[PDB]
């Protein structure tokens, strides 16, 4: 009770932290083991007011700090990790904010379980956007 | 001029010539 | 080797050559005599048999046709027939 479980000191409570780090944003999202219920979702957009640093490591660590204090306030100790890129037909590698957010989560008084990749990997995707001649910059 | 675009220009000119010839 | 003796090729290179590419054509196949196990008579079988052979007494199969050379069933003794 009191915004927390009745777990003993010897046992730790396990959550699931989806880190959807794409380009131009970074989502850190803590849920239960099934993922049905969500505790807190913080993203770099609500921590930098520049519209350019949404995927910045400076904003990513701040977002991870907020979900860390919220998890500790809710009495959550151990936390699995599910790293996710944009996926689909689009880019399959995680954005810049993934490493800073993960480092912040470890150092801000949290425990780490298993790390897994939940990137959407198609067997063979649809027509990816851009044209056959690519994005001419 | 690019050779492909010159080809397209000759196509448009040919369509104009055909239309005027049919008109007469 | 500017002076390879094409007149008298040695037997090991002659066997090494392709069948049609030798100095005189010689077929690689031969004729063998096969003994039907549990029988008494001797049958003639091609080395590169294309059809299944069954000697009259040996009601079981003798050779199984395959790609190059027929498979002799177990217990069949074979011997060449005059080159």
């Amino acid at each position: 009770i009191s915004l927390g479980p009745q777990v003993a000191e010897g046992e730790n409570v396990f959550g699931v932290c989806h880190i959807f780090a794409s380009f131009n944003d970074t989502f850190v999202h803590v849920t239960d083991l099934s993922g049905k219920e969500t505790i807190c979702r913080v993203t770099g957009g609500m921590k930098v007011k520049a519209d350019r640093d949404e995927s910045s490591p400076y904003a990513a660590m701040l977002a991870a700090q907020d979900v860390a204090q919220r998890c500790k306030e809710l009495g959550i100790t151990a936390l699995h990790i599910k790293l996710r890129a944009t996926g689909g037909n689009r880019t399959k590698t995680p954005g810049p904010g993934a490493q800073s957010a993960l480092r912040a989560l470890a150092r801000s008084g949290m425990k780490i379980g298993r790390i897994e990749d939940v990137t959407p990997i198609p067997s063979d995707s649809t027509r990816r956007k851009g044209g056959r001649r690519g994005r001419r910059l | 001029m690019r050779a492909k675009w010159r080809k397209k220009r000759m196509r448009r000119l040919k369509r104009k010539r055909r239309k005027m010839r049919q008109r007469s | 080797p500017l002076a390879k003796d094409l007149l008298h090729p040695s037997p090991e290179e002659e066997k090494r050559k392709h069948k049609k590419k030798r100095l005189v054509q010689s077929p690689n196949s031969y004729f063998m005599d096969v003994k039907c196990p549990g029988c008494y008579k001797i049958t003639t079988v091609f080395s590169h048999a294309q059809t299944v052979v069954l000697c009259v007494g040996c009601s079981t199969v003798l050779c199984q046709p395959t790609g190059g050379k027929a498979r002799l069933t177990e217990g069949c003794s074979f011997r060449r027939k005059q080159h």
């Binding site: 479980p5 239960d32 083991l33 219920e37 990137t119 | - | -």
Partner: protein, 214 residues
């Protein structure tokens, strides 16, 4: 105005008897008020959990779905729902200069559970192997796949969901593929990469109780 975590309550999720460890963890849900029912909301929750966390000294690259069917008090009893190899494992098994063979069967369990079984296998280069690529011919792949289909449907169609799960904990089927396919082409990287459920036998509660107990 208030955070809804004030009214959320915490329940303990339990495990089938196939594993020596019974406590996956803890879930939370809102309380029972009017139209919403806490028990109903907790029905059908899928808990992706490791087999290593559910066992003492087994492998760590396995995950299980473990959908929940019933709740009694503070405990949420849970039955088998599916198995999946982790993305890191399967990606690190996919190598070059070899042949990957994939098969899928659909089997109705004697209990009544319809299951789809994806099994994967990879060819082997030998210890004295000098050729760079160790490939398999198409007919050999067809023979390996067809033999793979039938020695994994015969292991599940003749047993209930209890025996199926506890025998895929060490994957005796996968080792059976390895030891049987060596007469055609050697394989080492053979694992049942995924099993998923398709139908369930009408939600008999008596089967769930003996699943967690006798």
């Amino acid at each position: 105005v208030v955070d809804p975590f004030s009214k959320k309550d915490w329940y303990d999720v339990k495990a089938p008897a196939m594993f020596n460890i019974r406590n996956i963890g803890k879930t939370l849900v809102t309380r029972t008020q009017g139209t919403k029912i806490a028990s109903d909301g907790l029905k059908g929750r899928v808990f992706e959990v490791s087999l290593a966390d559910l066992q003492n000294d087994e492998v760590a690259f396995r995950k299980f779905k473990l959908i929940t069917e019933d709740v009694q008090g503070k405990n949420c009893l849970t039955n088998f729902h599916g198995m999946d190899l982790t993305r890191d494992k399967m990606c690190s098994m996919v190598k070059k200069w070899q042949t990957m063979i994939e098969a899928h069967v659909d089997v109705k369990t004697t209990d009544g559970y319809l299951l789809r079984l994806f099994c994967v296998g990879f060819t082997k280069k030998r210890n004295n192997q000098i050729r760079k690529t160790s490939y398999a011919q198409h007919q050999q792949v067809r023979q390996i796949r067809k033999k793979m289909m039938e020695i994994m449907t015969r292991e599940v169609q003749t047993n209930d969901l209890k025996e199926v799960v506890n025998k895929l904990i060490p994957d005796s089927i996968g080792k059976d593929i390895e030891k049987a396919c060596q007469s055609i082409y050697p394989l080492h990287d053979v694992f049942v990469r995924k099993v998923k459920m398709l139908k369930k036998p009408k939600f008999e509660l008596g089967k769930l109780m003996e699943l967690h107990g006798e």
